[PDB]
Design a protein around this nucleic acid. Structure first.
Length: 74
RNA sequence: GCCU
């Protein structure tokens, strides 16, 4: 999977722990990117909370762009 | 595992 962008900031629109995925709104493009639980760095469960600010890379998965290496902004 |  190709890295599209790096160190992108965004706000978690929602993340459902039951389905194991959610969406993050990129602050730079205002577009939603898919985020799966496996793509989140640990100590985060592998989860993020609604409305929180996260930093992440954007990569090209099988069904389009998605987040990777998702953490807090520090 | 693409709108809860």
């Amino acid at each position: 999977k190709k890295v599209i962008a790096t160190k992108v900031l965004g706000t978690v629109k929602w993340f459902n722990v039951r389905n194991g995925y959610g969406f993050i709104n990129r602050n730079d493009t205002k577009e939603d990117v898919f985020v799966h639980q496996t793509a989140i760095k640990k100590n985060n469960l592998r989860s993020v909370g609604d409305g929180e600010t996260v930093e992440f890379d954007v990569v090209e998965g099988e069904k389009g762009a998605e987040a990777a290496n998702v953490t807090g902004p520090g």
